[PDB]
Every structure is written in structure tokens, then in C-alpha cells.
Amino acid sequence: MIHMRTGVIGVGHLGRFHAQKYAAISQLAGVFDENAERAAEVAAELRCRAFPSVDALLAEVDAVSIVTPTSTHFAVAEVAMQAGVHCLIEKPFTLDTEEADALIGMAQERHLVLAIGHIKRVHPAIQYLRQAGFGAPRYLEAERLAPFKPRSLDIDVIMDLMIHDLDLTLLLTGAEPVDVRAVGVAAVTDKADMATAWMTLNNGTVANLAASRVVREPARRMRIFWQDRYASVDFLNNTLHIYHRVRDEAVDLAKRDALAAEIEDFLNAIAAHRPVFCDGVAGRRVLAAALQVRVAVEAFLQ
Structure with a gap:
């Protein structure tokens, strides 16, 4: 049981499970998703919050899983690292390698752990x-x-x-x-x-x-x-x-x-x-x- 504020961005078929593990091994703050009904029922299942924006969630966690569609991994990840948060990004990492390099550099300058699933x-x-x-x-x-x-x-x-x-x-x-x-x-x-x-x-x-x-x-x-x-x-x-x-x-x-x-x-x-x-x-x-x-x-x- 680790003492850390965790959240998931994207709770579909796979992000829901990330959320579940976080809830069992950490203090899961809550989840965010562009589909609001889906984030609502995930938050009901795990007695956590369905935050109303990415930034609402990010202001309250140390670490997040990014399990949004692949084409979006760079965008979301920028906002998370910009906010000083650690990210576990589900595979594949990014679409092309320049996005990947950008994200590596961000994490390096900000001393954040960047993990790939x-x-x-x-x-x-x-x-x-x-x-x-x-x-x-x-x-x-x-x-x-x-x-x-x-x-x-x-x-x-x-x-x-x-x-x-x-x-x-x-x-x-x-x-x-x-x-x-x-x-x-x-x-x-x-x-x-x-x-x-x-x-x-x-x-x-x-x-x-x-x-x-x-x-x-x-x-x-x-x-x-x-x-x-x-x-x-x-x-x-x-x-x-x-x-x-x-x-x-x-x-x-x-x-x-x-x-x-x-x-x-x-x-x-x-x-x-x-x-x-x-x-x-x-x-x-x-x-x-x-x-x-x-x-x-x-x-x-x-």
C-alpha cells in the first residue's frame, strides 16, 4: 500500500482497470474522461471523484495513468507534465517519435517519472x-x-x-x-x-x-x-x-x-x-x- 495521490485520465475498457488497481494500492483521487457518463459510473464503482476537467484532477494528484486513445497521448501528457505530475502512458507510447522525444525531454527537465505500459x-x-x-x-x-x-x-x-x-x-x-x-x-x-x-x-x-x-x-x-x-x-x-x-x-x-x-x-x-x-x-x-x-x-x- 503506497501513500500517493493517483488518478486516471481516460477510463474506458483499460483505464477502468488502471483505476481499480490504483484504488486497491494507493489513494485514488478520481478520474477524468471526455465521456461524462462513463467517468461517472467508474467513480461510483470506486468511491472516488469524476473530476470535471483534466486540470481539476491534475491539481490533486501526484501520479496518473494516461489511457486515452493513442493519437491523444502527447496532448494529455503535456498537460500532465506541465502540471508537475508523473505519468504511466499505456502502449503504444505516441504516434511518431518526435512527440516521444518532446515528452522524454519534458520529463527530464521536470524530474518526473515517465513510464510506458x-x-x-x-x-x-x-x-x-x-x-x-x-x-x-x-x-x-x-x-x-x-x-x-x-x-x-x-x-x-x-x-x-x-x-x-x-x-x-x-x-x-x-x-x-x-x-x-x-x-x-x-x-x-x-x-x-x-x-x-x-x-x-x-x-x-x-x-x-x-x-x-x-x-x-x-x-x-x-x-x-x-x-x-x-x-x-x-x-x-x-x-x-x-x-x-x-x-x-x-x-x-x-x-x-x-x-x-x-x-x-x-x-x-x-x-x-x-x-x-x-x-x-x-x-x-x-x-x-x-x-x-x-x-x-x-x-x-x-
Whole structure:
């Protein structure tokens, strides 16, 4: 239980849950939303306030989640940081990278914690593998396959699905992309519905990343290979399996609330000057990588 004044801006499908976690782990001041009925019922559920403006809310909190539509993340975030408040921004960070850089600089001049909601970083398998001190992997092979749900249009498979494994690749390798080839297939829209990236980093690591949003049977698999070790991560069987040149160690992992852990980490970074689980600089790096992937795809697709 952290002692901090917290609020959420944007309480839709995902901001409502942010609000709930804040209410359980902090003193949630209240919420703001452009839809007023929706903010009203969120505030009724959590015995908190539905503030009548962004600035009413901001004058009364130390920290907020920004869970507004992506195109708005820069605008809202400026007002929040301008007001001296800490921000956890839900993924994706921003639309283009100059917005991202602006926000990083604001946070740096104002000594505010800027966090990006790249949730897989708090997954227990990713924590286990990082504490294992295995080094940078040689080969990464991810597939993220989703059912097409009725709101899945304008959801670009790269900025929505693939970005999770792009982020993981940057994190576990610590390297930046130097070559990016990609294929895409636009089936329903002209936007990509299936995209697969073959990506090479300056440390010579290869990541082979496949996302597809028009899929019938979901799947969140990632296989990571060092020289003498191999992990398979199954994010929805929630299993982690490590093999040593074979020996098959099944790591059993505690299930835990991923968003709760994310928010606890954001607040704990504010409170103790800890590095947060994913700062704005990392969010910018993954945003640039996904933009590369998309440029390569729209090259392929023409």
C-alpha cells in the first residue's frame, strides 16, 4: 500500500482497470474522461471523484495513468507534465517519435517519472530469464496471434501486436536494429493483418517476429536461444521451459496481476527514485523499431 495521490485520465475498457488497481494500492483521487457518463459510473464503482476537467484532477494528484486513445497521448501528457505530475502512458507510447522525444525531454527537465505500459516486461517468465544472467540471445522467434474481434480494424498488427515482442527483443539483447526485412499481407483493410519481420541488431542477433490479427486460434509464443541455453515462453499457457545442452527444466511461475505489478512498479519508482520498469526512452526505442518494420512492410505490400 503506497501513500500517493493517483488518478486516471481516460477510463474506458483499460483505464477502468488502471483505476481499480490504483484504488486497491494507493489513494485514488478520481478520474477524468471526455465521456461524462462513463467517468461517472467508474467513480461510483470506486468511491472516488469524476473530476470535471483534466486540470481539476491534475491539481490533486501526484501520479496518473494516461489511457486515452493513442493519437491523444502527447496532448494529455503535456498537460500532465506541465502540471508537475508523473505519468504511466499505456502502449503504444505516441504516434511518431518526435512527440516521444518532446515528452522524454519534458520529463527530464521536470524530474518526473515517465513510464510506458509495456506490460510483458513484468511477466514472471521475462523476470526469471533476466535474473538468470544468460547474456544477449543469438536468436529470437516470436509469434503473437489474435482473434479478430469486432473492434480490431485500424488496429495495425505492427503497432498493436508485434510491438510487444519488439520491446522484448530490444530489452533482452540491449541492441538496436540495423537491418529490417519484412513481409506483410493486408487482407480485410489495406492495413496489415499479418506481418512478419526478420530483424538484425548490431550485436548480430536475429529476431524473427510474426503477428497476425485475423487468426482463429490465439497464440503467444516466444523461443529465445543463446549459445548454450534455449527458453520457450508460452504467455497463455503461462509456462517457461529452459533447456541446457538436453535437460528440460520446467520453471514454475507465480501467476500475478500484470497490471497491478505494472502500477506498483510505477508508483515504487516515483517513491524510491528507482528506475521504472520501462521508461520513456525505451518506449521511444521500441516505437522507432516498429516504425521501421512498418516501412519495410509497406515497401513489401507496395
